[PDB]
Symmetry: D2
Subunit: 456 residues, 4 copies
């Protein structure tokens, strides 16, 4: 071990680790549960520092040898080389100071080595003086939150949603002719094509896409440039805008600086609004997943209208049993997003005066939902959605045995005789065909000709 120090004294830190005193210190204070800052955030926090170092250098606030060294240290974190250099829990200070300092110390110690120097107190580059220049935990962490959010949605959620969309869209067109018995209130209703029902699913997803995209512009607003309370004290006029442009360059996202830093620092409104669209997606996905479970339920004592690919081997003496494992995993995560929304709301409404101190928790919950939904759709798509095939024999068996097709004989034999054969088919226990044929109202040629399900 080596001795690190701050304004509170010296503290022993692992020799083989790049963090400093404050990280080692908060490590024995905030020892709560096992949740830590997710990779996507760590990278976003590194990107934030990288951009800030570039801007400081341009204003002459930093030397080239320093700024460049920091940028190179950041890029290493982005390359997954210092993943074990961030041991801080999510359950820390609400402003995320601990995590900011954590990134600062690790980034400073490494930049020192890259400059021929060494890690520790004799470091060439300084965490607060160099890496944390013209900024504060108050305005850095909200920025890292938005940078990680927009990118996670654009790079992960959106793509997976489109993929699942086109897949179900293909299925829609594919099964356009297959007609099946409808169902409202879990009861037998008027028929509709299996392709139209799936078209309901694709439409839902397409709606959620636009609803998610509507929330992006707000999440694009960066707080960097406001500092401690949002006034922008101790900064250059062009700083706020410049750090936003640099961010837009290296991430390729339409990042802009928040019009009002006071709104950015004291709230999480962008993430409360964006996550509102996510729970809306979870709601949609919950049904689409359930319709599959049910339609595919069976193979003998359920609905069994469709068939989904089997993933796990299962029993040998029971070859028919195929559990909707992909849907079960999908619905569970949908309950999870629903529950995460509450946690986020409670945190998003608990801000006070100049700063909201429920941030680490919000970003924790938000990013989890994006991972869950994004991975959930990809997993559902490949291991289920694409393998959906209709059980045509079972579909027709249920359509013919149904009593809803009596509606076609109303514009032929009348409402009196039509409802007469149906009430007799139900009461006794048979089909409509044999019911009308026995009453002498129609013949096998007449029934099969007039009762056409393909014409609704």
């Amino acid at each position: 071990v080596r001795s690190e120090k701050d304004s509170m004294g010296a503290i022993d830190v692992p020799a083989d680790k790049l963090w400093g005193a404050q990280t080692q210190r908060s490590l024995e204070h905030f020892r709560i549960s096992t949740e830590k800052m997710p990779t996507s955030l760590i990278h976003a926090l590194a990107l934030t520092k990288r951009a800030a170092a570039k801007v400081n250098e341009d204003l002459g606030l930093l030397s080239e040898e320093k700024a460049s060294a920091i940028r190179q240290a950041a890029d290493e974190v982005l390359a997954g080389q210092h993943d074990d250099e961030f041991p801080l829990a999510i359950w820390q200070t609400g402003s995320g100071t601990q995590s900011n300092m954590n990134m600062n110390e690790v980034l400073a110690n490494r930049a020192s080595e890259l400059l021929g120097g060494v890690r520790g107190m004799e470091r060439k580059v300084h965490p607060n003086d160099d890496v944390n220049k013209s900024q504060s935990s108050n305005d850095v962490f909200p920025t890292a939150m938005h940078v990680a959010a927009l990118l996670a949605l654009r790079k992960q959620l959106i793509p997976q949603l489109k993929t699942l969309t086109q897949t179900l869209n293909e299925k829609s067109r594919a099964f356009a002719d297959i007609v099946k018995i409808g169902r409202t209130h879990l009861q037998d209703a008027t028929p509709l094509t299996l392709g139209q029902e799936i078209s309901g699913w694709v439409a839902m997803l397409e709606h959620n896409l636009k609803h998610i995209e509507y929330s992006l512009p707000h999440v694009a607003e960066l707080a960097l440039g406001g500092t401690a309370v949002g006034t922008g004290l101790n900064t250059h006029p062009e700083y706020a805008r410049r750090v936003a442009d640099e961010l837009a360059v290296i991430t390729c996202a339409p990042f802009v600086t928040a019009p009002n830093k006071f709104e950015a620092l004291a709230t999480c409104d962008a993430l409360v609004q964006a996550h509102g669209a996510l729970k809306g997606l979870a709601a949609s996905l919950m049904k689409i997943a359930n319709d599959v479970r049910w339609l595919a339920s069976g193979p003998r004592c359920g609905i069994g209208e469709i068939s989904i690919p089997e993933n796990q081997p299962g029993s040998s003496i029971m070859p028919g049993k195929v559990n909707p494992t992909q849907c079960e995993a999908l619905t569970m995560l949908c309950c999870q997003v629903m529950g995460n929304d509450v946690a986020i709301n409670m945190g998003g409404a608990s801000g006070n005066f100049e700063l909201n101190v429920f941030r680490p928790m919000v970003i924790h919950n938000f990013l989890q939902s994006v991972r869950l939904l994004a991975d959930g759709m990809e997993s559902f798509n490949k291991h289920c959605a694409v393998g959906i095939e209709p059980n045509r024999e079972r579909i027709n068996q249920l359509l013919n045995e149904s009593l809803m097709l009596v509606t076609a004989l109303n514009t032929h034999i009348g409402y009196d005789k039509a409802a007469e054969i149906a009430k007799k088919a139900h009461k006794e226990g048979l089909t409509l065909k044999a019911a009308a044929l026995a009453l002498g109202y129609l013949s096998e040629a007449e029934f099969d000709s007039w009762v056409r399900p393909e014409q609704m």
Copy 2:
């Protein structure tokens, strides 16, 4: 009436309708809090009447209020308890977090009314005073919480619990009736090894039985009354015996095990008692939801669903019977869940000596109790009692299943049994047909060996 009388509070005079018993403050609140349509529920109003009534009796016993004046306020409260002054409480839920306005509302209505019993009149020439007399040795801070717990305990004891016990007995009766009816099991929504309908139903009986215990465990805390702590909970300007005396009184009138809160600061600063109690409600809600969905799915059809059971047709496609009672119950179960969240936010939002989110908490709590109570009641008499088994179809499903293949193991061996099942599946045949197709056993043997009664 277009005609109005001129009552007044510490801020000035205000026109109150001449045909109403409320005073200057209830009218001033009405014009400052016009938000939505929710008004304080009657169950809570009666709880307020009872609190004021209990206070009068005690104040009399402790010689703090004249007999003639105490009996007037007492008599006025009973009037409210008889459903005579329900239109005298217009104030919405969205008001002062302490429920001061509704406390004043009761004080004024009771003042003006009691004055008319003593021969006097309503208005400024009152013989009975709202704050001085009726709100004697009280505080809207310690009174409201009391009304809340009084309203909450009686709604649970005299409404919810009885209905919960009734539905249970019904379901328990059904379990024995269908104790021999064997039916296909379903895990992950797929066919599984069999079990009798009585067993599937006994699982519901056991759930409700567990909910009773959970709900009973949450009563002792709700029974704790805050009446006695006044302003900040120290009981300043009140009689030493007052708190225990009024708690005993309320206990005698309502026949409920009411006790005075052992710590007033916890009673005045939080809604914890109800936050824990509703936790039991959101539990039963989750339970009922499962019981409701199982019923409608098992009764789905009549041709393209499961259709193993039959439910009574209450509402007016010859055999399309919509499970409407299940839809009402499942809809309200979602409601109880959402209410829990609002109660949590409120119950956790208290500051220092007083939680000021009470009106919102009691509104959601009492609504949930009405829902779960009335929900189980109608679900019972309009569905649970008429549940009949579709023996014919249930048996048709057992035969067409492949899950009964295990019965052939002890007779012909797992491998042959497995083959039979694999064939029956690939070709879409019954275990009977497939077994006969390979010639592994005769029909006279299948109909003996695979005896579904053994599960």
Copy 3:
């Protein structure tokens, strides 16, 4: 009236009160669904009237309903829209998940009424038929969702948005008025570098401005009407132009950008449009909550709190002004949060062609809109407009703070400045006193250098 007439549906005859316009089904539902006190809100009833009205006009144009009979049903609907038949809709929220019973309720009330306009009477001798005439080319499945979105869009457009814009303008006005008033900042609840009150308030203005956009983005989806899909969404037994014609009609009467849902299956099988819309509401709720708490904390006191601002005294300890409007707003913000959860559970609980949790969803959605609407309105005219700064106290806090120590840096150096602050803290002195105690600067220099206007 004790007297009753004898109406009847497909199940038999039932006694309906002779003084009521509803029929056999609305009465049968009433006796089968006695759960709680919640009834369909008037805002939704008028939405139903408008849907039926729109249907009549279109059915007439498409020659499916006789002129004399269409104008009667149309005239009867306008009657409801004028607040003349509010007591004719007793059915509770907890009913059929599709809202069929309330659809029938409107059909029967409109039938019996229209019959009286054509000279005929109510009851079985009707000249106008409930289902046949009024529910022409419709389905309670595609009608209810329409009424929901019609009720939802108008409540947002004609109520919520206007009030949101008003509060914003008020707050925006206040921001400019206090643009020069410097005050101590507070992060983590601790004193921080300064900022003017105008800036602290401009943060609220910006929040509400953002909420407007978010709420506006959620309107296009709510505008999609399901009317035209009938039973399962295929539009069986309906005119090809019907769907677009009725959508245009509704758009003309309400002046709202209503359009027919591009996909009926998504419209009939889910409540997604409202699930996404309420997501915007729970957002504004979270925003208002912050705006409400900031106000009451800044006005807390008058002696032992922060007390930087003053709020109008609406309710009647000489200077104890309780922030009641903040308490009503914060209480309802919790309510909107809990409602979101119930909407989520319902909106995610749909099966196949139809979601049967609609009554519960619209109840919570419309309540939230009333709350947020009426909440911002009263909060504005009874608080937001009267917000006054306590210049004297605000200045007293700036001086007694240590956060202004940074102004001494460019003049005497960080180290000396740090020392001054460390001393002032240890001994409990003002930066002035401590600076003078060490003799690092004169008073004539402190009062010049540390100029709070620079932040």
Copy 4:
């Protein structure tokens, strides 16, 4: 790598890993997010198998050499030796089959080695035939859930709560004499002692203790012995009871077998009811934490009635700023438990027929809350609660400058003159003392004698 196989074919599994085919198979199907089965559960799942192996042996269903080998393999998992042998995500099948098989394969491969045999297909001990004897994922996973739950509450949550209780209880008695200005509606109210206010906190915690303990008896019910649908098919009559007794022995908990296995398999009622008490605790903790933040807010522009120990160093030029970091971390996790309740409720109500398939998610959320709350109270206790000391000078300054003490002069000078001096003290801008002294109503000797805050 080595080749493992099931009824679905061979699959390459890491040579250096103990799991089998089904684990390696579900590893590439259920690739969702980063959440995995928490240690406490893995141990509970191992304990379940250990107990089951002991019981099977007693009934003669298993040989001693096998049962004993399995028990030894389990004890190694419990000793944190195979922590990396469980890579399966939480987002899998709702019955937890994957995780059960995962435990089976890892436990079987190891037991084989312990028997002189080797890992792989040539294993001496078999996962399904030996380790998973007389049981199924349907009845094993719910048991592992309850075993981990009761133990987590008894061994972790309860103790931390008592510790925090006695600490605040000590503070209560300690500050019993110190009187402070009361506060209702955030406004100045009648006085009360600082010790009484803290007594409100201790009372809240004491209530939550009993409310948590009331939920334990239900969580003590085990499902083992019901199997697939709860009928107890393919088992010995004494099995169900015996596996429950064995569980009670090795864990030292009052574990009993569920009276009705149908209730145990199709619901999560015990955990929905138990977590109801947890959110009730989170609610209590939220306020207790907030009162501290506020009371300690300042040091000059807030309330500042109390002082809490400083953890992180902070700035040098701003020695007064002490952020309530411990409370911020505590409130965040309280929002988290609140949000977790919703996720659990949604999952606990979504069961169908004979089995609830939202289990992995529920146990995930439940166990997180227990960790959060338990660690949160310990962290709050040591790094804050114990260091709470009153700022007596600031407390009195605020008590004297208050206008609420005018109530004492009512039973002396009258309600007329008392309210007269107060209305003048407020209006002009001074204390009650100087206000009454200037009006000639009282003297310095009279005021300081009659106005006694210690007598309320």
